[PDB]
Amino acid sequence: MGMLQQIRGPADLQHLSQAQLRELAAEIREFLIHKVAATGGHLGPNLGVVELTLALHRVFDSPHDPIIFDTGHQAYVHKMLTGRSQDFATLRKKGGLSGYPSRAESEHDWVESSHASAALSYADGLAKAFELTGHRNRHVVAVVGDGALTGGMCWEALNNIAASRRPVIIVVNDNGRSGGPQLLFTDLGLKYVGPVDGHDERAVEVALRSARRFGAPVIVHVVTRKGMGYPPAEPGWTATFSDALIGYAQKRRDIVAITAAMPGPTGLTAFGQRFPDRLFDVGIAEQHAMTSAAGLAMGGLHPVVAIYSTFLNRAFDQIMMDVALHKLPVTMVLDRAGITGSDGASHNGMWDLSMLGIVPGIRVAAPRDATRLREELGEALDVDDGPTALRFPKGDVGEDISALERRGGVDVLAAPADGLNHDVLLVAIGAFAPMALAVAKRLHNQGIGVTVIDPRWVLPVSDGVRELAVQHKLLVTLEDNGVNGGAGSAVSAALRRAEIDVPCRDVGLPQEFYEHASRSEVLADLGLTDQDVARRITGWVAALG
Amino acid sequence: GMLQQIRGPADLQHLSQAQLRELAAEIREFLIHKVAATGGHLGPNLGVVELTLALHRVFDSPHDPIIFDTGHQAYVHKMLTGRSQDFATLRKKGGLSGYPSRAESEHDWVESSHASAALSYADGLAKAFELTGHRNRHVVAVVGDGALTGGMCWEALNNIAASRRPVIIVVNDNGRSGGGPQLLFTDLGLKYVGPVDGHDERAVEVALRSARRFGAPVIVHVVTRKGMGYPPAEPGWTATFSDALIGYAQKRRDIVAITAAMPGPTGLTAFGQRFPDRLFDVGIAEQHAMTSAAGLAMGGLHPVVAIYSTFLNRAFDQIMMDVALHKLPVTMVLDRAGITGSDGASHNGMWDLSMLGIVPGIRVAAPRDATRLREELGEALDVDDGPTALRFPKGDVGEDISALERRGGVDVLAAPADGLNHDVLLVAIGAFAPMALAVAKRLHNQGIGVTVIDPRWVLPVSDGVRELAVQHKLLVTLEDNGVNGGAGSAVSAALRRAEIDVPCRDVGLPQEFYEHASRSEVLADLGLTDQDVARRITGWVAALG
Numbered sequence A: 001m002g003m004l005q006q007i008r009g010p011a012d013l014q015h016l017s018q019a020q021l022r023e024l025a026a027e028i029r030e031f032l033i034h035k036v037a038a039t040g041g042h043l044g045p046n047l048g049v050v051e052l053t054l055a056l057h058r059v060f061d062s063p064h065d066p067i068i069f070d071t072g073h074q075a076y077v078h079k080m081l082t083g084r085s086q087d088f089a090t091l092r093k094k095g096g097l098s099g100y101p102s103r104a105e106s107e108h109d110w111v112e113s114s115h116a117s118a119a120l121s122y123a124d125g126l127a128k129a130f131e132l133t134g135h136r137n138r139h140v141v142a143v144v145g146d147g148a149l150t151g152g153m154c155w156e157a158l159n160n161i162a163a164s165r166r167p168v169i170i171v172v173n174d175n176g177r178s179g180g181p182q183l184l185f186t187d188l189g190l191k192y193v194g195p196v197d198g199h200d201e202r203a204v205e206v207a208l209r210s211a212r213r214f215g216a217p218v219i220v221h222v223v224t225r226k227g228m229g230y231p232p233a234e235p236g237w238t239a240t241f242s243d244a245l246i247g248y249a250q251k252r253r254d255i256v257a258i259t260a261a262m263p264g265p266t267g268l269t270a271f272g273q274r275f276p277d278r279l280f281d282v283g284i285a286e287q288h289a290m291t292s293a294a295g296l297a298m299g300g301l302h303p304v305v306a307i308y309s310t311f312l313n314r315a316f317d318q319i320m321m322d323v324a325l326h327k328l329p330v331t332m333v334l335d336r337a338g339i340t341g342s343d344g345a346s347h348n349g350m351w352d353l354s355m356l357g358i359v360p361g362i363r364v365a366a367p368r369d370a371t372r373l374r375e376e377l378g379e380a381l382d383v384d385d386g387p388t389a390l391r392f393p394k395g396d397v398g399e400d401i402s403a404l405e406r407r408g409g410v411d412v413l414a415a416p417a418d419g420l421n422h423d424v425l426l427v428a429i430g431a432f433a434p435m436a437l438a439v440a441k442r443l444h445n446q447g448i449g450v451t452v453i454d455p456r457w458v459l460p461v462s463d464g465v466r467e468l469a470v471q472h473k474l475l476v477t478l479e480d481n482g483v484n485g486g487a488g489s490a491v492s493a494a495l496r497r498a499e500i501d502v503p504c505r506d507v508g509l510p511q512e513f514y515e516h517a518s519r520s521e522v523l524a525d526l527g528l529t530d531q532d533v534a535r536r537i538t539g540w541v542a543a544l545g
Numbered sequence B: 001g002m003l004q005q006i007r008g009p010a011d012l013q014h015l016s017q018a019q020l021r022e023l024a025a026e027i028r029e030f031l032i033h034k035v036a037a038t039g040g041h042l043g044p045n046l047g048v049v050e051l052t053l054a055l056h057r058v059f060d061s062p063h064d065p066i067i068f069d070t071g072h073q074a075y076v077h078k079m080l081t082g083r084s085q086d087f088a089t090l091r092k093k094g095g096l097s098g099y100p101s102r103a104e105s106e107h108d109w110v111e112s113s114h115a116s117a118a119l120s121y122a123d124g125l126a127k128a129f130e131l132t133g134h135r136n137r138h139v140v141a142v143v144g145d146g147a148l149t150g151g152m153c154w155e156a157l158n159n160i161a162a163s164r165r166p167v168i169i170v171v172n173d174n175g176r177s178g179g180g181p182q183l184l185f186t187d188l189g190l191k192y193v194g195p196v197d198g199h200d201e202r203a204v205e206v207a208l209r210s211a212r213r214f215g216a217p218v219i220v221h222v223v224t225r226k227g228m229g230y231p232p233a234e235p236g237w238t239a240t241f242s243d244a245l246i247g248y249a250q251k252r253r254d255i256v257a258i259t260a261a262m263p264g265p266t267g268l269t270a271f272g273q274r275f276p277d278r279l280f281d282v283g284i285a286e287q288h289a290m291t292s293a294a295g296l297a298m299g300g301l302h303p304v305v306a307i308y309s310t311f312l313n314r315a316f317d318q319i320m321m322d323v324a325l326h327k328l329p330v331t332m333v334l335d336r337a338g339i340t341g342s343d344g345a346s347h348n349g350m351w352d353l354s355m356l357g358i359v360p361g362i363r364v365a366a367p368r369d370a371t372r373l374r375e376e377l378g379e380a381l382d383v384d385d386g387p388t389a390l391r392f393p394k395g396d397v398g399e400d401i402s403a404l405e406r407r408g409g410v411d412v413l414a415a416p417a418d419g420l421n422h423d424v425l426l427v428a429i430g431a432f433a434p435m436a437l438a439v440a441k442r443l444h445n446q447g448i449g450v451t452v453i454d455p456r457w458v459l460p461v462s463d464g465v466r467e468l469a470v471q472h473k474l475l476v477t478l479e480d481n482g483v484n485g486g487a488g489s490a491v492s493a494a495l496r497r498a499e500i501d502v503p504c505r506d507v508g509l510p511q512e513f514y515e516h517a518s519r520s521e522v523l524a525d526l527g528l529t530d531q532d533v534a535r536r537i538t539g540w541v542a543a544l545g
């Protein structure tokens, strides 16, 4: 990596020959292949933008010309050219290099959000700011994937950008042609340059220079190959969902599945292979996924919309006014619910119990294990008079956790030992059932008697939890979700509405954005461990009265 | 008297062009006579007389679904589907809805007033008809030029363009002879017909028949005149906001204002006249409004985004990942907060305190009166390290409500009379301060001592409300917002986090969609009156002593 080790920042590219840039691109690929996991590392999308990123830093003067990556998972080459190549040993590790652009890491980084299709909206705002503050000759460059370009925010932003001569350069990074828009963007009233071969570094520079000089908004359409230069790049909760859904759909022809551009990761690819007419991929279009789901339901079908928990924030108003307002039987399946960790603040699925709690009439399940995922999906598919949601975490599902009994839909997982009393009702939400059972055993050791329940259907709060609450002295909810408007607050609200003033505590994620770390590190750092939660509950029980 | 003879669409089928001219004139005089001058959408309905006649001359509703985007312009549709006699009750409790209603007519599909969704429903419905083998159902979406500036239209058109399934996109364009798209939609890869003279009933039928027989999706571009045939068509809270904002912006050149296509109704028109370079109208694009605000803030400005409470649902993920994640000083101003009444379930601003409570670090104010709106806006504009929001109702502002004292941010509006106990802390949110004071007077007469407080900054919950809560036997929050995740639930959560187990009660709007009625009728039907609330608090004070 002789030449790469000499690049201190973008201007070190400025007098390199085309032959030197060809050598450097080879070094960058070797570096990426060595430093980045071949699976789940975004190696492919980064290999795809080596020449594009060299060309951007040869034509634009960052950060005077902001270079804004849409989604930001493909910014590794950008970081390597902005003094951070030495930091890749720590990529996506706690206290290490972020997987996304980071304002704290570099003056060259603007947007930390992984949520796609936002770059052009930031670019419009920044271009307006530069005009209002009289900064001369700042060219805002948005790097927008073909996938990101299927998102409605890009249309809102392009409509606004097209109303002004303020220079926004729209660089379409298209690796969906040799997943992108069906619509043409050659004749929208915006100047269009290309298509450009995105692996011809000089061709990209020529196109970017024509865009820079045009003196008004311009689309530069560049075509890249995901994984360019590396042939390979060219029992899970998700697997349990995939198998369960196919099983239900074998018997019921009215079940259809919808993904916003993530058929593989949501486990819907296998569903499509069995029922290819019944799987819809709507692009990176969570809003359209939900409202087209409402349309399918108005036509007599029972859609299953699989969208990762964090991305469902985009569909809030569609869940409200298109699905819930019409009492339509849409099931939403939220994978990556709770802490995901390594992809940082904008990936953790920590909003969905708080957001869905606002929706009139909604029923929300949080599976504790594989059998409860299968069971709760079956129940969701039998709700024909309004929306349902299931939420479950990323990664492997542990062993089934058996109930001692079911009381009004509530699974009793543990009950106080004979000789101990009904001290604490521990309401274990979804994937925190193992933590709650460990807490109950630590409290048993202190002579504190704990009933652990899985409510299964967390919203609305069931008769089961009201009936058990009055038999205990303290209710503690334990949830892999933000505490503000979360399951704990919903349980307290339900008790108080029923004139039950048993003290309640809401144990979950503080209402904060978290830095990247492993799930176990994030939970350890917040004191969401059986040891720390048991110590807190010991303190609450001692303080009663 | 031809209109009296139209029992449904097929009664148009054998009318002469002269008869259609006469019927259009009767429809206009009917609309002018029956529809309220302000807030009745007379203009948009007068604009679609010939278009709606043409739709019901070419399409066979409901076999061919006719879906109105936003649905405020469906009055002619209702007059041609057996409901002309029902207009005496238009937008009255138990009367005709101002929007399409599935319960009123087999010809009505979508009840949501939230714009830009029609094409998403159309794609889903068209998919459903194919999956269920219904023959020859043409889904017609009537999409205003304004609605067409929304991102959902781009997502839907992208999906529709991938299939030959017959969706007919009727663009009802009254923005050209300017609230429609800047982008061209003549060359998107979809068949384009027009532009058509939208007041030439025959020419509109010719274009729609061309679309119906095409055998694939088609855009029909129809140009209409808003208020056609009525020259005139061709409040206090808001005015207080408008004046206050202009006053602050006089002294601070970094204040910018953003509207999603409602500069008049949000009170920003007057701001633009004073500061024309500092008002942005982004179209019907709440998502772009918030993320372009993030871009403006990243360029050193302090944006004020004025969006009606209910429509801010669309911007939830942008508030979260674009504004809040980057700790940017964007002030959101939510007019039409709380019950609005007459525009039905999809207009009531009853979600914002629950949705905004999810946002890490957010500060939310609810003005009780004009002076507190001025004060809290100034305080919002002085927050430089994260998002702020102000929410206030539709209509006229009453007299200022003076505080006895301010304690830890909190205004004490009433305290127990000398000789009464500190029985109830009544936490009056925003516009319910008058109701809270009336409740306190009634309970005073019963010998019940009430502290009424306006917390001013509802989120995060202030030291002031924790300090006063420990001094009372009962805490009751009274809020013009859904109870689920609302101010009352937040106050309870904050006390419990601080180890304060004073009984809390959440008095507000049940988490339900409300039928159209006046604001006073809705609040009376829910028991949100000083008489019914004082009665509930009497019952709680009795059970606690």
Ligand SMILES: Cc1ncc(C[n+]2csc(CCOP(=O)(O)OP(=O)(O)O)c2C)c(N)n1
Residues within 6 Å of the ligand: A045, A048, A071, A074, A114, A115, A116, A144, A145, A146, A147, A148, A149, A173, A175, A179, A226, A260, A261, A262, A284, A286, A311, A314
């Ligand atoms: C709102 C949202 N939904 C989904 C995703 C997940 N996502 C990341 S990349 C991608 C598909 C590819 O998009 P593109 O913009 O073409 O990027 P590239 O092909 O360069 O990886 C998706 C669905 C996201 N980041 N944001």
Ligand SMILES: Cc1ncc(C[n+]2csc(CCOP(=O)(O)OP(=O)(O)O)c2C)c(N)n1
Residues within 6 Å of the ligand: B044, B047, B070, B072, B073, B113, B114, B115, B143, B144, B145, B146, B147, B148, B172, B174, B179, B226, B260, B261, B262, B284, B286, B311, B314
């Ligand atoms: C999401 C959303 N934002 C704002 C509005 C309020 N609204 C109603 S009509 C309109 C502007 C005009 O739109 P258009 O679709 O052109 O209808 P028309 O001109 O026929 O009234 C707006 C902003 C809304 N209904 N939905």
Ligand SMILES: [Mg+2]
Residues within 6 Å of the ligand: A145, A146, A147, A173, A174, A175, A176, A179
């Ligand atoms: Mg791509």
Ligand SMILES: [Mg+2]
Residues within 6 Å of the ligand: B144, B145, B146, B172, B173, B174, B175, B179
């Ligand atoms: Mg219009």
